[PDB]
Amino acid sequence: TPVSEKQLAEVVANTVTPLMKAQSVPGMAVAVIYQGKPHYYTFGKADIAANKPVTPQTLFELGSISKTFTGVLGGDAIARGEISLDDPVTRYWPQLTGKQWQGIRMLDLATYTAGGLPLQVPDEVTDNASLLRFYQNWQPQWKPGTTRLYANASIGLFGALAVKPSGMPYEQAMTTRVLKPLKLDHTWINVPKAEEAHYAWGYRDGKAVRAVPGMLDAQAYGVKTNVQDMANWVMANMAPENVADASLKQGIALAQSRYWRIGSMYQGLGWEMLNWPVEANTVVEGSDSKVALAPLPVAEVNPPAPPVKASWVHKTGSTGGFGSYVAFIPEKQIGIVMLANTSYPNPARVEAAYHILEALQ
Template identity: 45%
Template sequence: MRHIFLPGLGALTAVSLLFATVAEAADDPRESELDRVVGEVIRPLMEANEIPGMAVAVTVQGKHYLFSYGIASKESGKKVTEETLFEIGSISKTFTATLAAYAEAKGALSLSDNASKYLPALAGSSFDAISLLDLGTYTAGGLPLQFPENVDDRDEMVAYFRSWRPAYAAGSHRLYSNPSIGLFGHLAAASMGKPFDDLMEQELFPALGLSRTYIRVPKDQMANYAYGNTKDGKAVRVTPGILDSEAYGVKTTAADMIRFVEANMDGSHLDEPLRRAIAATHTGYYAVGDMTQGLGWELHAYPAKLDRLLAGNSAEVSLKPNKVRKLEPPRPPREDVLINKTGSTRGFGAYAAFVPERRIGIVMLANKAYPIPERVKAAHRILTALADEPGLASTR
């Protein structure tokens, strides 16, 4: 796919048109139509939310298409390309969940094990009765969205967890929490005997075929690392924090993210433990209204009505405790679902969604944290077009 830079545009116009995608229709007749469908959704979205740059990838029946818009850095004016790295925020949790499920598939842990088994310093605490699965599904009993501000090193982290007391019985309520899934990833790495960052960068990412996905962006890739943008226009990148790698630390390209989405829909090229791990992340463990909580990923019945998809990604679900219904036995992976995850850091906003039954998916990466409902609506429009247009995807 070629991209053409359009010089001489004013700053406002540049937000949505600076970097336009041109289809190689001779190579794939669908590409021109996809360019139109995606552009008609993404350009107005960028203008309305003053997003400097976006990278969008869609996958249709095993083939992916990449679209780049705008600029990666306001200061330099460098345009977004297929090599641009974005922070994906909490979509990182899907990688963390995959690593933990991979550890279980290789016999290093069991999700039913108590958390304190893998961190002896927590012995005698509430985590003697909280399982790894509880941590991975945010049902440990009310761990908060973020650590308290005074927790900024490992010793303080352990002291915080030791002193923490659940507000709810484990498995009764879901409260979305970085400390919860952060500890989940930390303990999974401990079970494998290596640091979390090393396991991700040296084992999991390569096993998934991801060559430009990082926790720690290498020096030779820093020029490709976009700058995020705050609401008041300041250039930012993610601030280090306790268990940040596990909860929101991945930086990647749209090309790598869509490969990850494709591996989630068809992992036949992966080794057996990794295939089992991915299946585990699609397993339904708890019902939260119309949404089903997997490991990292969140699942919705398909066809997915927009109002229910918005409800499942709402502040009511992400910021408040919700009573859950435990699925016993856990619901095996299904094809007739829409699987999704949002992610944000201070300066970036991301969304990924896919439908295994149709083998369609989308990744949207932006260097601004714009409202989640806008992401969901835009992706829903594009996925609906992919599913309903015979020229773009197979019929039902």
Template identity: 40%
Template sequence: MLPPFVVIRSSASMLCRMSMLAGVWFCLVGAAQGQTVSPEQLEAVVIEAIQPLVEKHRVPGMALALTIDGEPYFFNLGETALEGGEPVTEHTLFEIGSVSKTFTATLAAYAEAKGALDFSKPVSAYLPPLRGSAMDSISVLNLATHTAGHFPLQLPSEVHSEAQLLEYFRNWQPQYTPGSKRTYANPGSGLLGLVAARSLNQPFAKAMQDSVFRGLGLSDTYVEVPQEKMAHYAEGHNRNHQPVRVNIGLLGEEAYGVRSSAADLTRFLAAQMALVKVGPEIQRALQATRQGYFRTDYYVQDMVWEQYSLPLEKNRLLAGNSRKMISEDHPVVTVIPPLSPQQNVLINKTGSTGGFSTYVAFIPEKKFGFVLLANKYFPNEDRIDMLYQILQAVLPEVTGGSETGAVDTDSGSP
């Protein structure tokens, strides 16, 4: 049996009834005219997709949002904590892990739109203490595309202060020619955020709040959660169902430190698809992050975003989000000239902390968006299964190819 479950459309009057499926309470706000998927069909699709995952991982709470032909729907399930929590809503705050990197890339692209940053310049151009180091040959774009030359997944544990951080980057040496391979790493994304903030002469958290979150019209998204919003911040749960929250260390804010809601992430994806109006500089920044710079075996690497051609093979999506893709170096081919933002593709990013799971994806041509937020860690494979099952039901034309075969996707990376 699922926990209490509510489905909300974004406007008009509310229609509520008891579902015949799984004993779930179902509410729809404003039945849409001319829908390709009826409310009853959507209800059945979502319940079928989420029920195995919720039961398998004992997920306390989940906020799922779908954008169908440009129309947002919010599916709220369970509570913000295993004990003593409040009902999850589309405004509940979740840790979004490495989906934070998409906002960091947006800040860097915004700085470029303002004329403060040039992605082709070396990192050391914006951090003078790193001049004379390997950072003279690493471009800002390399940081945004995970192609700098093999940073470790996490900063070494002995790096505790900003002075030690700069010393670490001064002494770091690439293990391959920048731009020849892709290595997923938090230090590189964190350094991108540091460079972007320095180029704007602001602390990172302030630059994000003032320029990106405010520019996108986001009201539930924070690097530093205000005290008055803490009551809306869900409690995370690790594999052993113990309560946990993320530990924000050096470069953590920049790489995995954002907290957000289903409502705000849905608006973020809507802005990516030009479904909501934002300012010209933010719009240019969003478009810049979706240019394609490198081809991997599975997808095109944009700035942080990963772009899959359609029709979408499930095994390719699983492999592209696998532990192997996170933990190993992968050869890439430079796209010359870079691909302009594509419409008939699926663009995605996963995110995790020790107690939270996030997955966002969108298909601009179909005006389709997917946001999954849960206050329990579970593997990427289960998140992808949910997305793919929903796509097969609501957009079958974008799915195809292999659907079987095990791929190792379990990763605890933020």
């Protein structure tokens, strides 16, 4: 169904406007990838009190969508020959001597199958000495490679260890190996003073808020970006054949590979996938925290299945004051980015995105 630019504009507006009013969303930046190019639509305010509108230059906090960058950076390191997903975690952290770590691979850290690592690294951890103490003391509730339990303590460590062989700190490795080659020049972990004027304000219970530190925060949920950079990020991931950097294109393919199957979903590195075609209720009913935070049994995909073009590839992300979502279908070469300055229900994000993409397929 060939939709015109005019009809596309109407499809987006008619879906986004009622959503924002029902969910009390202050502002939203949307990007739709259709017929080889990005289409931008901006709504509302970035700063309500100052009355600043949302523009394609407005910066939003990505939340867990930051994990897709971690997965690709890790994939790039594997493609360079620096690390292997089959290597034990201890190969990259010798001081981690606890015997409970035997059998736990880099793959397990990256895909939340280490055996029960908790959602977050505790507040007590304020340095590297205490970080080690935490992982050394941890006792697995399940055997490695049997149970998926979404955790920042898991993927966060994967990201920190994956960049060790390069000799660069995580931020520097991400900039040099992923951001720069893709020309994502307005994507930050640390927003410079010159860019603070573009930084949107997040809202929670009417209160204006913005992200604060941690330890493995950059690896798990510390990325800030505008809708233009995000659209290009989605384009590189849905069409890696067009990226020149050889290790990066392979890294993108590795992040979308299928390592485990959990019911109707498949776990990649950062990215999560479902076979296309898929109905909305399957995708929507899967985005509920009750199911998203639960420890679920996994089915090993061995060897890992390469990227399947007929897939619904996506990732949700939130912070105290922001709610974002990204979804794309490679077979159709269509995708969408929805960045907002309020954390509204994930099922609502999925429903809206599915509605828009359904009109383009």
